[PDB]
Symmetry: C3
Subunit: 157 residues, 3 copies
């Protein structure tokens, strides 16, 4: 199966997309209500928005890719009064990036994400989306590096 979904509890779901090489945590944080098919589909759409934002910034498949990487971590849904989501993403730049190259990657990425995630508007799920972007630096050529290392999800599990 291309996507493997698991309930750790009614309101905490792991979603591993093999085909696209992504991993996200789904949380129904505010209400603690059980995740439904709609919530998971919403999460899949935001996972797609992030990999599409990544594709706009540069192809992360090419060998020697110099970054940045934009990676989804968690979609936290607030379904108490209205339908809202907070998407947590990591921006990963190379340890060898200069002050300006970082400020540049950060602004470009935020622009792409505001568009792809439909920030501050209601989307095709009638969900209004916001995001938070954590910044990381890593030696991108290191054998120790993977854009979705398990460590990067500790906040959410």
């Amino acid at each position: 199966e291309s996507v493997n979904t698991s309930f750790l509890s009614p309101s905490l779901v792991t979603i591993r997309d093999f085909d696209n090489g992504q991993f996200a945590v789904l949380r129904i944080g505010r209400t603690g209500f059980p995740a439904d098919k709609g919530d998971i589909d919403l999460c899949l759409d935001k996972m797609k928005g992030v990999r599409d934002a990544q594709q706009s910034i540069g192809d992360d498949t090419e060998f020697g890719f110099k970054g940045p990487h934009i990676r989804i971590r968690c979609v936290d849904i607030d379904d108490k009064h209205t339908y809202n989501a907070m998407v947590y993403v990591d921006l990963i730049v190379g340890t060898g990036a200069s002050e300006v190259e970082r400020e540049t990657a950060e602004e470009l990425a935020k622009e792409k994400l505001r568009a792809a995630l439909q920030v501050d508007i209601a989307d095709e799920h009638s969900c209004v989306t916001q995001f938070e972007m954590k910044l990381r630096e890593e030696l991108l050529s290191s054998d120790s590096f993977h854009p979705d290392k398990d460590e990067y999800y500790k906040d959410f599990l």
Copy 2:
């Protein structure tokens, strides 16, 4: 329609999307790994609980005054024989007299005994009992859902 996950050999989460239910399957006494039969059993007890519910009243209709009968956990004892303890919540609105509460419990207990086939060997040769926890909630609140995660704390 149904998503099943093994948190450990003996602890399984079962999310039924179609019927909007969630149950924890636990093989409590022995700690033996859950097999397809145990999952089938859990699914059939989930069906029994929602059947009991519909017998008390449709929980789909807006305005539904309650009460809610919700499955939480199916604990299987497969040591010598095949037994199951089904943990359910009976959820009553906070605006309900004590006469109404006990009256709703009794009506609940009676529907569960029939639907879960309590004290008899069922289609899976399983002998079933249940334990029912009483909760009161403002059914109309935006912060209420019959299967809120907090209701599962004791089984996860």
Copy 3:
């Protein structure tokens, strides 16, 4: 026939119903997310273990006196090259002589070296090692199961 769940990106439970097995897959050294190849690798090591089991004796035979060889965990190291550590349990009848244990232990170790392709690159280009834990249980006790949940505590 197989149920796979991600507890985290690098920790997967795998329940094989048809062959009655359970294993924890972890990408220990790197913490990298498990991919389809890693899971397929785990399934191959699970198969190696049950083939080793059939070598030592049909565990599906009634009154099966033992021993049991059971997979617990496959820990993948994919940092520089592709390697796997397979954690297994050897379970002997609690009433066996020192020499009968010794014989069981060396026969399982040999069948496993072969079945898990120890020290050589396998069909997934992975180089495997294993680690064996010794157990004894009353194999006829109703409280006994080769894959009891207690046996995976080190890994979950």
